[PDB]
Amino acid sequence: GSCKGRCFELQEVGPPDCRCDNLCKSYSSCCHDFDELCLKTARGWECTKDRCGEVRNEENACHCSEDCLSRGDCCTNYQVVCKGESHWVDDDCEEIKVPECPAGFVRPPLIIFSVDGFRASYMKKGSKVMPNIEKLRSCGTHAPYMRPVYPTKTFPNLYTLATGLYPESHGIVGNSMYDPVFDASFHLRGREKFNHRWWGGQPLWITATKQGVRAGTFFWSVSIPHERRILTILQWLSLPDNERPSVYAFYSEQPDFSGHKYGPFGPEMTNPLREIDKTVGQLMDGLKQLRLHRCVNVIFVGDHGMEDVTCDRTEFLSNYLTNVDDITLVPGTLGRIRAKSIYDPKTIIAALTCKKPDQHFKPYMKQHLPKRLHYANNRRIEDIHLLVDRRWHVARKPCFFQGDHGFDNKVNSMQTVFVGYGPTFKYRTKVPPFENIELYNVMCDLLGLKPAPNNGTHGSLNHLLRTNTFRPTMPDEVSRPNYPGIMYLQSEFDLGCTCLNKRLHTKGSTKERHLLYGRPAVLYRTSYDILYHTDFESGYSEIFLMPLWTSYTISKQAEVSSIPEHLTNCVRPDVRVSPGFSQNCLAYKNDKQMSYGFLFPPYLSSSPEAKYDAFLVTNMVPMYPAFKRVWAYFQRVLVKKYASERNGVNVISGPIFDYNYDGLRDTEDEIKQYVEGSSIPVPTHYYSIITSCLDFTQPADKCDGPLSVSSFILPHRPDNDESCNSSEDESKWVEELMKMHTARVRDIEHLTGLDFYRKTSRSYSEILTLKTYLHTYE
Ligand SMILES: *[C@@H]1O[C@H](CO)[C@@H](O[C@@H]2O[C@H](CO)[C@@H](O[C@@H]3O[C@H](CO[C@H]4O[C@H](CO)[C@@H](O)[C@H](O)[C@@H]4O)[C@@H](O)[C@H](O[C@H]4O[C@H](CO)[C@@H](O)[C@H](O)[C@@H]4O)[C@@H]3O)[C@H](O)[C@H]2NC(C)=O)[C@H](O)[C@H]1NC(C)=O
Ligand SMILES: CN(c1nc(-c2ccc(F)cc2)cs1)c1c(CCC(=O)Nc2ccc3[nH]c(=O)oc3c2)nc2ccc(C3CCN(S(C)(=O)=O)CC3)nn12
Ligand SMILES: [Ca+2]
Ligand SMILES: [Zn+2]
Ligand SMILES: [Zn+2]
């Protein structure tokens, strides 16, 4: 029952035999001499000149004997001091076109250097502070920043980074949570976080194992110091082929704790960032000694950032709620509220709403949260949710710490890092910021694994790599469109809707000026019609009795027009579409709460003649009066502003149906609200994809080069309780509301079932990059 020659053994012992592994401390089940033999701390972590060629003393932490390399247990600076070698950092940038591995290595191994609470902005401290990390960055591939997932805590983001899944999917939705099925809670302290029932999806280390690729243990007991964690990875790498793992992971608790006490912008950050760099320099020195510095892919990545947060800035729910003792709260940089006695949600959220002028948080129903934060579809996520403002804190009842994290994931302070250095990674290359949901696939490709189903767009990050074994394919269309001409007659429609002669509603100047990037593919079985007009094209769904999409383009110089007093109630019937597959105004009269608006704006028609097309029944959708305030402003004002700033814009607006908040398209049965006395379904959100030329010196409709997209998914609310100053002019709130519900085109695709950018002069990998972009207005 000893750890003599078992320290950090990969293969597991299991009880009641004593263990010597990385997690043996976390069960208090290590052998008696574990701390003596495995946490050996004698004679420091660096070789010295006098130590060179020593006789192996097994009490020393690392070794400077010549037999050390054959056990992979040297100090990292062994060959630097003793032999004539140099530190890795003190060497020029040499490109790694091919992997240069020693004998036995079949694939290039992957080490994942994780750094907890490593804010993106820390990378600006530069070579003088972080010389090792700096080399990795500027020598390999790096992003300005990598975007975490909400709620930008550790366990959600590190497991998202492990699985490629949104927290809601894999189930680890916070550092602490409650599961009503289990009837138990998860905590960052305890042995409960080790129970496998909590952990869903499939992490990288299980994917690898299932495909016969051995994995080093990603988990490190806190008792194990950082110098030892590196040495253990380096010992494992020294093993024989049948034993040596291919995928590794290091975990630093820093620079999180430091940030929590001295803030992100403290000058006390320099020392904890210097030790992080030491740890990296140790790894990279240690790899060079094994001739692995031109063989190993090294990923340097963080979980989240850090923000300035003092105690003085804390909202208390006892000063908003009167029945405080009834509720349980998950506090801090976010809020999740729940009933104690297994109380009324409607009252709580109401009481938390726009109560004080300088209110530093906002209540939400999980489904009403911004869709970009895919934080709803899980029984662990509470109905009532609080989005707390940055720099701020929420408690239930009433200065040690000066920093914290956990806020909205588009917050600038919450942004973290990514660096790639290896044979497979691009040399001296810089890439756009990306989401951590994506890296699972890259890490899978780096190891030649088939990724498990996840929420990364697999082609999104091919530009990180010099070579990839995954060429993405644009999906096959399921439903072909009908192209109906004028079939029915004006007199044949009775819809309860009041209000030239030609070859009307035909192509030409329509599909070229308003579909600038090709017709969206549907990707699901449904009958729908293409409808041509002067100012817009649409994909009219015969099932929902409204467009799936409405594509149209506004030039920079395009002018705005007012809707007259006549043509205010005007809802014209569409002769191309049958009465059977059309809406009626009678339903909207029955429905006192519901009204209607238009997908294509009559505000931006070309001529007064063409404005009549904007009033077609095929262009009309169910809208609450409350939402019409939002939508009308967008259409009448903002589209023109965007068109002016961006030298024209292509707009693809449409309805979304998500009544089970799973972020995916609703089936017919899943729909809940129809308009009174009809089967016209009420949308939950309204999207728009506003595309233009990144080269703004060219018009949006004459763009040769890359595209530039800005999108959103506005919630179709019967009120503007969300927007606190909604009592004011729309010029004061509406645009902020839109910016809060920004979206990736990809997010809209999931929800609509549609597929955009089917016809471009652009590579498909680049289009996937464009579709995973998120506009942050930061
Ligand atoms: C992020 O990515 C994840 C992973 O892909 C998505 O989650 C999956 O969503 C799909 C679609 O709803 C789910 O599909 C269903 O899986 C069932 C099998 O379940 C078992 O296996 C999965 C995978 O290992 C386990 O996760 C799960 O616990 C079970 O053990 C099937 O029986 C279902 O059958 C369906 O068949 C056809 C369609 O193919 C239709 O008749 C029906 O749709 C029918 O349900 C179905 O395929 C899947 O289970 C989810 N989990 C996983 C891990 O795959 C997220 O939706 C996605 N988030 C985004 C992008 O918003
Ligand atoms: C989630 N997680 C870890 N993920 C990685 C990782 C994942 C993907 C990568 F690509 C690279 C690395 C390493 S460890 C974790 C941790 C983190 C350690 C910790 O104590 N967290 C922590 C520490 C300080 C702070 N401060 C703060 O504000 O938040 C903090 C968080 N403790 C653990 C423990 C257990 C697990 C489980 C074990 C079971 N397995 S399983 C079922 O797949 O076998 C899942 C992971 N992860 N587990
Ligand atoms: Ca849905
Ligand atoms: Zn963390
Ligand atoms: Zn933290």
Textual characterization of the structure:
It is an enzyme of class 3 (hydrolase). Glycans are attached at residues 351, 455, 725. Residues 1-42, 43-87 form the SMB domain. This protein is an alpha+beta fold and 778 residues long. It folds into three domains: 108-165 and 201-309 and 404-470, Alkaline Phosphatase, subunit A (3-Layer(aba) Sandwich), CATH 3.40.720.10; 314-398, Gyrase A, domain 2, CATH 3.30.1360.180; 490-771, Extracellular Endonuclease, Chain A (3-Layer(aba) Sandwich). Helices cover 19% and strands 16% of the residues. The protein has 16 helices and 27 strands. The strands form eight sheets. The protein has a seven-stranded antiparallel beta sheet with strand order 19-20-21-24-25-26-27. The chain has a six-stranded mixed beta sheet with strand order 6-1-7-16-2-17. Helix 7 (226-237) runs parallel beside helix 9. The longest helix has 21 residues, at 625-645. The two termini are 58 Å apart. One zinc ion binds at residues 116-117, 154, 256, 303-304.
